Amino acid sequence: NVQSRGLGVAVRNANDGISMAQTAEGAMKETTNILQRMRDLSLQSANGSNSKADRVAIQEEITALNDELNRVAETTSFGGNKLLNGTFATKSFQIGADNGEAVMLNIKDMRSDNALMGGKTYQAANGKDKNWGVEAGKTDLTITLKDKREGDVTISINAKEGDDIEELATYINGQTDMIKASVDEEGKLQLFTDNNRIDGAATFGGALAGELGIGAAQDVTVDTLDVTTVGGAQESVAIVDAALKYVDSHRAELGAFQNRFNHAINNLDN
Amino acid sequence: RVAIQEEITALNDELNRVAETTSFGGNKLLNGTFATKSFQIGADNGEAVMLNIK
Amino acid sequence: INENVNASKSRIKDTDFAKETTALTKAQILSQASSSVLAQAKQAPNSALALLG
Amino acid sequence: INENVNASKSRIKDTDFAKETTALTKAQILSQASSSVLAQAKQAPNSALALLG
Amino acid sequence: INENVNASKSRIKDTDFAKETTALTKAQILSQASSSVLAQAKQAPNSALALLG
Amino acid sequence: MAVNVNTNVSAMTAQRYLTSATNAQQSSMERLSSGYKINSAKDDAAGLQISNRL
Amino acid sequence: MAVNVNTNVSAMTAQRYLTSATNAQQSSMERLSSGYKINSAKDDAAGLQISNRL
């Protein structure tokens, strides 16, 4: 009898865990929707066609959406709690007739200033103009990386001779998905490093690396995402893509949690 | 595949939970601690049937 | 959020008619049976008296 | 590319109305049959009472 | 302005039919449910009398 | 066995299959309206990531 | 799921996606008549400034 009553309470608590999961997923979709909206619009602002008057309009709209991610991270409550503020620590749901067989739940903070929502960046000290091209004997570009999984990855990029400063960035993007590159206004490369998988500083070496600027590691997030020149525009889309990957990964974890619990109800009922 | 592994390791905890949760009034049906239990289904003693749950 | 909190305002406050009505039915036959026990138990003192005139 | 990626954004995210509607209808008959089973499952205790008024 | 104020003169004064009709239907099933409860609640005194003819 | 009134196992079994019938039916009637079979991560965690990227 | 009559989650989902369609449908039928995809600032902020300048 105690087990039977305990199971009835267990499916009640477990169902509450499902409701808390889907309420977070409800604002999850909106967070993804805004992030995509910035990414396409940052692509528009990356144009060389628009003037500074158009880009400041972009930044006005971007900072408008930026306030939205901060607001939704605090608004989502579910009856006085704080799902997305980050104040929600690991809460264990008792889903059994007896005690001790609970399941932990972690909902990560999703404020636009969160570290995992952005990543590191590096800038070339000296730019290269249009007439400049990659010269022979100065094409090697070896990058040392620290990775959360299969760490200590060293990737070498051999730029094709005669490539200018722009198609060089495209070549680096194609060769590896761990690094995003783009030139801003004079040829300076903006290497991007996604924080949630490429933790740690990246070391640059090779003849081409010495030809350009090694640059320092600067932390940038969605909150610091500012697009007023096309250089920040190419930087922002890289930042947004990292944010979208993080949000989607957190959504998948919540989804598997929902399936664990959906399979928990019919088990407990059985 | 990282997300898929997240679903797999999530479901992995489910088997490790249900194997330890199925109790039937405090016993452990699938935990493995359930040895060969003999049920007496006869008028006299000795006429029992053994049963094991792996 | 409003859609999902309304879902959470179910099985917390809302009742499901399926498991509840069968509980009501079980109690109806429980009342009908229990009452008939009283009717059968009224004659226990009556048959108790019958041993002596 | 834009034509084909949109095609790939179908049967991965987009639903078909061909097989989804049959899944919905099969669910409707399943729930109706189960609910009607409840109707004949309520009087099982009632018949148990009927042996003794 | 006239177009916009007419848009604003809706969802404050104008009703919808999506959520309103479901509110009406939910009300109707509620009325039939409680009305049938009276049917089962009328026989409760009857069973009270049945213990003594 | 037990022709009783306190436990209705048959009603409980119909209860469970009614729950599973309208849980999947509730999963439907929203793929049709939205037009997507992927709208929450619980439907397909792997599908959500690739679909969002696409 | 708790088969109840006070709350209709499926109806609420259908209503939400109904206006998600009629809002975009009402977003169209006005760009068709006007002949401009940009007629209010909420459509495209950057597009409005450059179109006005052009």
Contacts with A170 (C-beta within 8 Å, 6 or more apart), sequence order: none
Q: Which residue of C has its CA nearest to F7?
A: C26
Q: Report yes or no: A242 and A119 within 8 Å, Cβ to Cβ.
A: yes
* Interfacial residues of A (vs F; Cβ cutoff 8 Å): 21-22, 25, 28-29, 32, 36, 244, 248-249, 251-256, 258-259, 262, 265-266, 269-270
Specify the long-range contacts of residues D12-19, CB closer than 8 Å, at least 24 apart.
D12/F38, D12/F47, D12/F50, D12/F51, D12/F54, D13/F36, D13/F37, D13/F38, D13/F47, D13/F51, D13/F54, D14/F35, D14/F36, D14/F37, D15/F31, D15/F32, D15/F34, D15/F35, D15/F36, D15/F37, D16/F37, D17/F32
Touching chains F and C? (3+ Cβ pairs < 8 A): yes
In the sheet that holds A119-123, the strands lie side by side as A190-194, A119-123, A218-220
10 Å Cβ neighbour count for A5? Answer: 10
Contacts with B43 (C-beta within 8 Å, 6 or more apart), sequence order: none
Q: Is the CB of E47 less than 8 angstroms away from the CB of C35?
A: yes
Nearest by CB to residue D13, choosing from F8, F17, F36, is F36
10 Å Cβ neighbour count for A101? Answer: 16
**What is the resolution in angstroms?**
3.2
DSSP code of A142?
E
Q: Report yes or no: F10 and D44 within 8 Å, Cβ to Cβ.
A: yes
Q: Report yes or no: A6 and A246 within 8 Å, Cβ to Cβ.
A: no
Q: Name the method of structure determination.
A: cryo-EM
Q: Is the CB of B14 less than 8 angstroms away from the CB of A252?
A: no
10 Å Cβ neighbour count for B12? Answer: 12
What gap in Å lies between CA D14 and CA A19, rounded to an integer?
25
What phi, psi does A144 have (nearest 5°)?
A: -95, 130
- Distances in Å between the Cα of A155 and the Cα atoms of A158, A204, A235 are 10, 10, 22
Residues in E touching C17 (Cβ below 8 Å): 33
Task: Using DSSP, state whether A205 is helix, strand or coil.
Answer: strand
Closest residue by Cα to residue A58 from A83, A73, A40: A40
Q: Report yes or no: A64 and A41 within 8 Å, Cβ to Cβ.
A: no
What gap in Å lies between CA A233 and CA A184, rounded to an integer?
8
Task: Using DSSP, state whether F9 is helix, strand or coil.
Answer: helix
- Distances in Å between the Cα of C11 and the Cα atoms of A16, A20, F25 are 9, 14, 18
DSSP code of D42?
S
